Subunit: 442 residues, 3 copies
């Protein structure tokens, strides 16, 4: 039944297209002048509603899915599967970063152009920042893993601020911990996997609890169906809202066209050559057919700019349309949503290269490898915090000591590349799910 099967793909594609058309027409016809902030808020609001609907069920879905999938196979197979999945994510993220190096060195976006100016973008506020240390970020990562409390971990995550408690002499900034908003999805993933291993290692005592969690998860898929049916409207109004929020006739595109073209082509080549080729090589099966099976979550990733938010739609689509195993999907896809950030590593690396390129820095081999490794680590380093969309580049440049004086340039256009990032991240997660499913089948 092609007409009924493909209707969602048609709606979300038409919704994105109508969103760009609506927002461009509104902006050309006056935009905010005709709108005002109150009508702007009401215009964006259905997008916010979609995010609120999707951020509601990621907690039940992730927790119950990991508990019900981790306890569907013995711990030895679980360990082999997880180790191979972590290796696949690490390899793809490293490859994406190297690919970004390759394009950014070649196309040369940091040539002399309008983007040389940074007074308007920075205006002195770029240097003023928390300036979080790399060791502190890794410690906050390892403390958001193994959370202090599970309930607070369902809406809070450790972040280490810095105080000036060194009044005795030579004032130096010293860390203090204070939980701040944002889910600890990584901590819940770890606790859920560990708990599922525990129930599998129990026997008749845990059958009840597995049945509980699987039923809870299936009810959450039942919610996901209806949120999917709503999702095109939210995508339309969210995309339209964000392009009325800043004029996009082509001024920033004319300013940073080479950079944005690198980031988008890097995401496309990573999305449309590499991971498809890996899927070819290993499972010998059609990646473009599989990719077509998952278009509504990819469009939702584009619309939402949040990999965790599109995950329920993605798990529903992958289990329903594509012939992916339920337990493999349950285990792999949430872990991919908090570890695997191929596009994030990509445009973080391309950003670092671009800002090094302007002012004519060297970046011969050692600095290249450092950016690769720290980008691969920051793929998960940014995962714990939702606020740090591109904030983690600053700590990389602190580690490698590059000019952070114009980091604010990308904040004007973080909202475009991060969408393709989210698309690529969920894409890599799904391709890994299919690949590992067919391993476990073999």
């Amino acid at each position: 039944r092609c007409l009924r099967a493909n209707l969602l793909v048609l709606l979300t594609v038409v919704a994105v297209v109508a969103g760009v058309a609506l927002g461009l027409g509104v902006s050309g016809a006056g935009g905010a002048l005709a709108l005002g902030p109150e009508r702007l808020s009401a215009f964006v609001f259905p997008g916010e509603l979609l995010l609120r609907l999707l951020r509601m069920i990621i907690l039940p879905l992730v927790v119950c899915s990991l508990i019900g999938g981790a306890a569907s196979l013995d711990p030895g197979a679980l360990g082999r599967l997880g180790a191979w999945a972590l290796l696949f994510f690490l390899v793809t993220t490293l490859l994406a970063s190297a690919l970004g190096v390759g394009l950014a060195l070649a196309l040369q976006p940091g040539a002399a152009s309008a983007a040389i100016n940074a007074s308007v973008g920075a205006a002195g506020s770029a240097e003023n920042a928390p300036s979080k240390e790399v060791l502190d970020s890794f410690l906050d990562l390892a403390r958001n893993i193994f959370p202090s409390n599970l309930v607070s971990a369902a809406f809070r995550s450790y972040s280490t601020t810095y105080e000036e408690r060194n009044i005795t002499g030579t004032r130096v900034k010293v860390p203090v911990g204070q939980e701040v908003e944002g889910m600890n999805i990584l901590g819940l993933v770890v606790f859920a996997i560990v708990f599922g291993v525990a129930l599998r290692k129990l026997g008749p005592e845990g059958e009840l609890l597995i049945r509980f969690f699987n039923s809870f998860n299936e009810a959450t898929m039942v919610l996901v169906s209806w949120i999917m049916w709503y999702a095109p409207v939210g995508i339309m109004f969210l995309v339209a809202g964000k392009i009325v929020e800043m004029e996009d006739v082509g001024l920033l595109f004319a300013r940073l066209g080479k950079y944005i073209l690198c980031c988008l082509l890097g995401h496309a080549i990573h999305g449309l050559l590499v991971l498809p080729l890996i899927y070819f090589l290993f499972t010998r099966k059609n990646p473009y057919r599989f990719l077509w099976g998952i278009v509504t979550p990819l469009a939702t990733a584009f619309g939402t700019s949040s990999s965790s938010a599109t995950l329920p739609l993605m798990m529903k689509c992958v289990e329903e349309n594509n012939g992916v195993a339920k337990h493999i999907s349950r285990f792999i896809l949430p872990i991919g949503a908090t570890v695997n950030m191929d596009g994030a590593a990509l445009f973080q690396c391309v950003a670092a290269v671009f800002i090094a390129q302007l002012s004519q820095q060297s970046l011969d081999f050692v600095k290249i490898i450092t950016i690769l490794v720290t980008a691969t680590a920051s793929s998960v380093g940014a995962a714990g915090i939702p606020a740090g969309g591109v904030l983690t580049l600053a700590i990389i440049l602190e580690a490698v000591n590059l000019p952070v004086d114009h980091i604010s340039l990308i904040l004007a256009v973080d909202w475009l590349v991060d969408r393709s990032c989210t698309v690529l991240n969920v894409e890599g997660d799904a391709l890994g799910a299919g690949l590992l499913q067919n391993y476990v089948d073999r």
Copy 2:
């Protein structure tokens, strides 16, 4: 067994009467002069303890009851039942507001009297307020519906503050969202109903989870029994505490007797003529007998001034004493506790009319209809926030542009009318439960 059956009614009535006697005697004998703030806190404390006990179980009770009642009948019958319930609540709230217009126009409480003065009540602090917009309030309502997170929704609710991020020119206050304390009982109700529909649409997978939620709820009724047995002591000390908190020899009654008489008679006529008449007309059965069946929750509503807090006692009383169906009670009464505010619409409307009446405003027909409609909407608009006992009148007067310069007059006596409001709200919820039960029986 009349002697054992009616003992609770006797205790709570005697507790309210002893509370007023105790507080009046303490106030006449010196009150705070003989008491001091520390003994005042210890005096009020058992009332606070009762509220803490009741605010503990509304979350488990509401969530599990809606999940266990929503999944006891098919979604078509659920939709018809819910639509008719929402219509009944809307009709009763609209009627209560119109009734308030009718009394407030006739008895004329805004005549020239001591209440003409407002310098002491306001003293310039009345104008200083958040001044929340109507669109912003509706958006916060629709964001507390569909919560961002369920766990935080179990003790937090979206409220839109306003900042001054328009330093570029013509400084205008712009909204910012920040979650603030207070349960999102509306959001949990919606999620629970939706989830119960999901489990009914599943089959054998959800039987386990329905049995879980029903058992959890029955255990919470078991707690409700003992909290009921404690409740008269808390009611006594809470009423006594609140009348020692302000002298009530008759000064404020002499100041605002016409207003308070309108609000109380409006609640009585709504409670003792209208909803009884509707129950007569539809089910042909004794409303005063039914009303006598539920007196302990009504007295608790009077004592607590919190419709959500008396709800567990109300559900226990309605399922146990009166012949109301378990599933109908479970579904209807929590929804009534967060949507149906007949008395709230009533005294909000009467307050608006009274303050319009002093200074001799017109309010011919169009303004009357606007106050009716915005009061019917603010019945649920105030439900999401516990802090806004009478705060939502300010946004109505902002919508219709009346003098808010003496809104602080009612804050001295918000504590009296709101009790009868809570009584009427829970009364309307129960009458709707009986009426809709007998529809579903037919």
Copy 3:
């Protein structure tokens, strides 16, 4: 299998010993000068990780254990068991306080010595404090019992700050409530016991829910096993971190040797004569063998300085090694972890006596009894708040009006005596568990 059975005892003892050796060697070799704050944070961090791991599971473990143990015996037996347990805890805490009086009067630590000076310790900051009232502390205790919300009670606890809302005249500090961080473990214990009674009073409806909670708890024991296997590393680095945090060559020991010797000998005599003698007298069974069975939690108590944190390890050890009944352990040990603070009452009393002794106060009989009773009450009074490690002594001295001008002396060395306190508290809990188990056996 002695070699495999005793390996954990060997690891944790060797870990504590290696911790003191490592920290003393680091401090002598330069300490912070060679370390810096960043490496200091990384050095302490595995200890923080152990606390985070243990603070994660106390909520599931305590809640599910009480629900599964409270509903394993009828309410009459539960009431007799609980009343005898509360009496045993009260008797042991009172005895510990009296024992502290006996040593502190005799050994005389408040003699004229270096500890007479307090300018360096206090410097005027000792008097500046919240100065919480005794009535307010008891009210906050009774409000953390019977929490307003369960979810917030899983990471927040009521604390009454004080404002200056008396600008009318004679400015006096008036209480205001505001929830502050720290679990309401007492409130969850009460709700869980009450809920378990509810499920036992139900029949077939609650069997499902008991099976759920028991399975959840057994999975949490499965986590406890692995946290136990990690625990020696955390103990080593935590002890080493805390002794590098302050130089401990003997300066503070030379300053307060008599005081610390009293506190440690009081804990030892309470731990090694009294509770063993009570166990002798009642069950006629080997307390030192039993004490040897539980050494890893006692060492963890020493390392962590947190009675609630070592509780999962303690329950696992007591149910597994020693022949203690599952339901008795489940019921008694969490209650002991939030009520029974024998060592806390002890060193609070010894602290009060010591500061009275310097400046040569009388403390004849009545003041002695007041310190005994208020210490026995503050055993639980400090339990609700984790921050008040020794903060509750100030309210005692406010009650009895002693010099608080040098309370900051103990803050330099609160970190040593509180460890032996935690050891003694968990010890008394376990001895009570064995004693009451053998009563119920009889």
